[PDB]
Swiss-Prot record, chains A, B:
Protein species of origin: Salmonella typhimurium (strain LT2 / SGSC1412 / ATCC 700720)
Pfam families according to UniProt: NBD_C (PF17042), SBD_N (PF07005)
Residues reported in the UniProt entry to bind ATP: 257, 359-362, 402
InterPro entries: 4-carb_acid_sugar_kinase_N, 4-carb_acid_sugar_kinase_N_sf, NBD_C, NBD_C_sf, OtnK
Effect of disrupting the coding gene: Deletion mutant is unable to use L-threonate or D-erythronate as a carbon source.
Catalytic activity: 3-dehydro-L-erythronate + ATP = 3-dehydro-4-O-phospho-L-erythronate + ADP + H(+); 3-dehydro-D-erythronate + ATP = 3-dehydro-4-O-phospho-D-erythronate + ADP + H(+)
Enzyme class: transferase
Annotated NCBIfam families: OxoTetrKin (NF043035)
GO molecular function, one term: ATP binding
Family, as annotated: Belongs to the four-carbon acid sugar kinase family.
Protein name: 3-oxo-tetronate kinase
């Protein structure tokens, strides 16, 4: 099977964000979590491999990324795409520079591009400086980011602190001159000895131009924006997602997130569907968890309503705050995640087929519990949140993180996607 | 002046919670922050000294607490009350046990009570076990508390791990037999060699009985519930707060909290009063902060509306979340707090007289900025949140933490308190 783009992505939410852009722009795509062990899946032109390499030590990030590349090369991958965060989340110790230089050496290439922009979400790049909304990176929220605070907005400096070579810039104005101009400026940087080139983008046309220039680059790096541009080059001779359209069968909402938006979604949905709040006093041990998971699964399965029953832990998420009101939310405890783990397996055994899950940890535990390793990426319910179909279990997932989605997410997930 | 109860409180929000219960039950009360340096203030029968001794090292907690006691004794304090948290927030290293034993030695006393209950907020104690709502401490949210996770609910064990002596229990049923019975059981514990006695309470009557039994104990320890009971003993021959009724003059709402409820309060209030959102890109340096504080003060002062203008930082509090939607709130940055600091001083210089402040850090910085050291505790706006009047500046404050209050707090603060 032909594998056109192989994405190595530094996290899970962004793996699925880029995969969704490829599918929305005509390229069928499977996401596999962790370095793949199998064989290229059927039914896709892109594979997005998801790693946990954004913040771990550089060496672990290099090793995981090279393992991913060995696999992609084995499947005949035509282009490799290193996907990192749109706000260039890294420190002077990595992991964008160290992984990029490693991939370049493994692919025996001397020049690559860096393209973080995603204008539709307010990330733009001008003269090489990254903007979050209407302000420079370093004058935005990112400035006090908990893990990787970003106190400089100039991408070539951010890159050079972290990487071995010199980094150049292709400004918006060159892109505006077009393909020939942009390709000339790229060559010129390379003749001058730059290893890397940051690429400007203020709007989706700029990304389309980059896509057109870089159709055949062996390696390319960036956020999701450039992928969109590359996808539309392949869309250009014809398209027609299907493979990740959700399956038939009963659905369940499993909510573990503590967030403002998840709270709104649970408050809304619970007026429309039978729901049940996870009691923490029944999760405090194994035996109790095991029995409670059974009871809750039997509860879900014995419902008979149009919309999917909900099991929400978001009330429990609000308990520290209920007593000392100086605190707010606290994220779902290990004991509640352990419960969701057991619950998901049993729901699957009892024939639940569609799982609408709120929370990044909860999505993780549900996926790992059903033993799902990868999936076909389907249509969007909301930006960043597509329906997905497991590769080797007949199960469909819609995994939502933190504050993604709108109020009616849990309804739309169902109502706008029937058969 | 007669000083009946001297409270040494291990934090700020609880200092003001206990002070409010004394005032609501007839005992005029000043709160002083940090060990007092002055002379007993006029116009009160209780003084609540607020320390930051809940989580610091035991030795710092002992030293601060003894300094507080030296002062209270100098003013002729008749009873000392060690106020800690109702959920007994501590670890095996302190600070409840170490401070209690120290106070006992300084007061040359051999027996004291421990009374955490506050039933109206769902803290009850039965047979010495602490309950948060309908569950034991250790099966409630407190179990994974960030600073002091509580994995045992039996107060005498919690106390003994932390303290030098043996700890007994007076059960609800004895309280139900009354004063004579309760006082007999207390003596009996003491003859048996216990240093301390935990006291049950399921309801406010139990607290009233304790208050009646312990009117003349030299030292007493607990949360706010027992204070209520002691206050009503002194209420018994007549009462009639006034001193902390808010002053005349223009008001301002200063909102720094990132919380769910603060968000609701800001969203609500901003439809009723002129408001202005703090722009973080104008707080990133001194000079900019200084000028921005000026501009914002001039803005507030030049308004002309019935209700107080608001300066809210809660939009800025939501910026990390706006970009990577996996995150939620982030608490107000140092640069925003630095701004509020300058802003408060200028508002005071320009004649603002009433400050309605949302956020614990923000309350801190506003208070420190106006150089307020203590205040007369006035009436409640909401539970835990009274109007307060500075002792040495003609300024009135209503300081609200995190998720205290209801939706209309910022209106009620003004509308239910006129002259």
């Amino acid at each position: 099977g032909m594998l056109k783009i192989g994405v190595i992505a530094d996290d899970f939410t962004g793996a699925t964000d880029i995969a969704s852009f490829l599918v929305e722009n005509g390229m069928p795509t499977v996401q596999i979590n962790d370095v793949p062990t199998g064989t290229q899946p059927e039914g896709c032109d892109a594979v997005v491999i998801s790693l946990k390499t954004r913040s771990c030590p550089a060496q672990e990030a290099i090793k995981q990324s090279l393992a991913a590349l060995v696999w992609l090369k084995k499947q005949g991958c035509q282009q490799v795409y290193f996907k990192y965060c749109s706000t260039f989340d890294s420190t002077a110790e990595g992991n964008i520079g160290p992984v990029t230089d490693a991939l370049m050496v493994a692919l025996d290439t001397s020049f690559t591009v860096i393209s973080p922009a995603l204008p539709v979400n307010g990330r733009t790049v001008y003269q090489g400086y990254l903007f979050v909304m209407n302000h420079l990176l370093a004058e935005s929220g990112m400035r006090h980011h908990p893990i990787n605070p970003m106190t400089d907005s100039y991408l070539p400096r951010l890159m050079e602190a972290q990487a071995q070579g010199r980094c150049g810039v292709i400004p918006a104005q060159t892109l505006d001159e077009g393909v020939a101009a942009t390709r000339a400026a790229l060559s010129r940087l390379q003749q001058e000895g730059y290893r890397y080139a940051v690429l400007d983008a203020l709007n989706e046309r700029h990304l389309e131009i980059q896509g057109e220039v870089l159709r055949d680059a062996p390696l390319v790096t960036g956020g999701s924006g450039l992928a969109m541009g590359l996808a539309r080059q392949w869309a250009k001779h014809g398209v027609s997602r299907s493979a990740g359209y959700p399956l038939s069968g009963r659905a369940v909402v499993l909510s573990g997130s503590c967030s403002q938006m998840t709270n709104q979604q649970v408050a809304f949905y619970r007026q429309h569907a039978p729901t049940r709040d996870v009691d923490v006093a029944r999760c405090l041990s194994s035996e109790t968890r095991e029995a409670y998971a059974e009871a809750l699964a039997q509860w879900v399965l014995s419902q008979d309503s149009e919309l999917a029953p909900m099991i929400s832990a978001t009330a429990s998420t609000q308990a520290l705050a209920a007593i000392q009101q100086q605190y707010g939310a606290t994220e779902a405890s290990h004991a509640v995640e352990a419960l969701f783990s057991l619950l998901a397996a049993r729901l699957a055994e009892g024939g639940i087929t569609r799982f609408i899950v709120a929370g990044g940890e909860t999505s993780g535990v549900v996926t790992q519990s059903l033993g799902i390793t990868g999936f076909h990426i389907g249509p969007c319910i909301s930006p960043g949140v597509p329906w997905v179909n497991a590769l080797h279990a007949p199960v469909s997932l819609a995994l939502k993180s933190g504050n993604f989605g709108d109020e009616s997410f849990f309804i739309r997930a169902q109502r706008e996607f029937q058969v």
